Amino acid sequence: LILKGTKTVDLSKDELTEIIGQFDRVHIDLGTGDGRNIYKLAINDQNTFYIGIDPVKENLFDISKKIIKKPSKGGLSNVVFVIAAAESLPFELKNIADSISILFPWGTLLEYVIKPNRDILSNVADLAKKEAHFEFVTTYKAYFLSEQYKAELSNSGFRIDDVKELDNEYVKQFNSLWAKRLAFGRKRSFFRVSGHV
Ligand SMILES: C[S@@+](CC[C@H](N)C(=O)[O-])C[C@H]1O[C@@H](n2cnc3c(N)ncnc32)[C@H](O)[C@@H]1O
Numbered sequence: 059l060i061l062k063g064t065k066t067v068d069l070s071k072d073e074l075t076e077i078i079g080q081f082d083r084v085h086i087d088l089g090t091g092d093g094r095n096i097y098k099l100a101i102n103d104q105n106t107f108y109i110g111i112d113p114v115k116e117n118l119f120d121i122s123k124k125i126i127k128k129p130s131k132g133g134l135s136n137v138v139f140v141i142a143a144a145e146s147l148p149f150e151l152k153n154i155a156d157s158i159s160i161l162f163p164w165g166t167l168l169e170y171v172i173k174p175n176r177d178i179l180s181n182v183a184d185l186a187k188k189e190a191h192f193e194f195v196t197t198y199k200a201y202f203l204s205e206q207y208k209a210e211l212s213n214s215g216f217r218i219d220d221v222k223e224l225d226n227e228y229v230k231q232f233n234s235l236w237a238k239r240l241a242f243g244r245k246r247s248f249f250r251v252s253g254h255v
Pocket of ligand 1: 088089090091092095111112113114117142143144145160161162163164165166167168234235236237
């Protein structure tokens with residue numbers, strides 16, 4: 059289940075695999091929001107295939123509409139938007155990504171990261187290949203380096219290598235409206251848990 063314009067269509071494992079073969083790397087942005095972060099990402103890295111996942115199709119309408127245009131007028135070919143929720147990822151995404159990403163999640167995806175939820179998180183790891191990079195940027199440090207958290211994450215397939223506390227400046231490289239509200243909002247701490255699956 060993917061987004062063509064503001065339309066919902068069907069993509070097979072078949073067609074996905076072809077599209078993918080034309081790119082050196084595949085990247086998943088779970089909880090992608092409005093596609094702006096991905097769009098920026100895709101425009102600069104034409105050798106990475108990008109997949110954004112979000113169950114809320116309406117926030118993607120504008121960019122989904124934009125990526126579908128001609129390349130002369132804003133179109134892109136390295137971007138697909140999947141409409142699925144973290145608690146039921148499509149089978150066609152197993153063992154597919156070189157790097158997975160969960161940026162600024164909220165509601166339940168925030169909790170699945172923070173708690174963490176071993177079962178759901180494990181499905182996210184399942185979307186990843188051999189030694190695929192990962193990245194988790196939450197925001198509301200010592201909690202993330204705890205042993206209970208680090209080992210709750212291993213258990214799911216997520217091996218922590220680095221854990222930085224970040225600030226507003228870091229968030230300026232992102233394009234979503236949400237990320238801008240936070241970048242130029244009040245001073246705040248953003249947390250980044252990166253590593254290999
Ligand atoms: C703050 S917006 C994310 C913004 C985008 N990731 C960014 O960094 O700008 C929160 C997003 O998380 C998504 N979300 C919350 N729970 C989710 C879940 N369980 N599975 C997938 N997406 C989820 C919502 O759909 C929403 O689009």
